Amino acid sequence: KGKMAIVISTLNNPWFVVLAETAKQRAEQLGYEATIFDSQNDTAKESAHFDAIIAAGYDAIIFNPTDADGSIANVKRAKEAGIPVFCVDRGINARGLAVAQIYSDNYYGGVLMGEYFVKFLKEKYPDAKEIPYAELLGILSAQPTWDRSNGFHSVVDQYPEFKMVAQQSAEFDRDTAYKVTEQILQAHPEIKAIWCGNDAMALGAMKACEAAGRTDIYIFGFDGAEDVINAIKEGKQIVATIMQFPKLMARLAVEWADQYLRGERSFPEIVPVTVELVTRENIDKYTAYGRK
Ligand SMILES: O[C@@H]1[C@H](O)[C@H](O)CO[C@H]1O
């Protein structure tokens, strides 16, 4: 057997709880001990985890980086120590240092949502000369933040009726998104929609919109997390999200670490995992964190 370290960006995100626990469970099912290390969105805490993990002689690391550039020195240190690293959900801007990186096709998720954003909103406001909107960005040091925003804009920018009047990071965080949205609503009451880089931000934005009596603002998220599935299902003002498949990601990452540890050496360096569009029209095909 042996032991696997599961190092996660933060556990203050329902989606990362699922990702981390699927990995831990899969490691255990394959006969490893496994420990989850919560970095709390802090690259310094992540580095302390990597020190401790190296000292404890862990056999493999399942890694979700706080910073696509800054987390590289942690990976390098594990590698020097002979500990293979498998990235899950976020990648690093390197190569060779991770055996494999498995994460979603986040650009394509952005494109899927940009399309539905345009479609849903032109349908609600066919004659409007401007449809003003706001974007909540994820954590700026996370690859998915930009992949999703870039992909979204690749579509929505082609439709100049849509005017992005505010753009700000809410750190992939619900309470942060609440405060940020509360400030955005004061400064730009004309917005008719909010596109958010993850579901936690969608939920914070919704709470803020509801508090101001602004239940007319259509909110668009990303992840397929429990309370966003629920919101969409209950007919609330979050009308869509992009389903990711953390259970698949986590499972592959652990299985490959096991396979690596008995000599398997051909894994691809980058594996994109597909995503799907969730709407009011198809919500019944989905549950929290996956299909059914
Ligand atoms: O893919 C994940 C999820 O969107 C999470 O909610 C924030 O971190 C991203 O890397």
Author numbering: 1 to 292
Paper text:
Solute binding induces a conformational change to form a closed state in which the ligand is bound at the domain interface and buried by the surrounding protein.
The structure of the tmRBP ribose-complex is similar to the ribose complexes observed in ecRBP and a thermophilic RBP obtained from Thermoanaerobacter tengcongensis (tteRBP). Although ribose is commonly found as a furanose carbohydrate in biological molecules (e.g. nucleic acids), all periplasmic RBPs, including tmRBP, bind the β-anomer of D-pyranose ribose (as initially postulated by Koshland). β-D-pyranose ribose the most prevalent form in solution under ambient conditions (59%). Seven polar amino acids make a total of eleven hydrogen-bonds with the ribose. The ribose is wedged between three aromatic amino acids (W15, F16 and F172) which make extensive van der Waals interactions with the sugar ring.
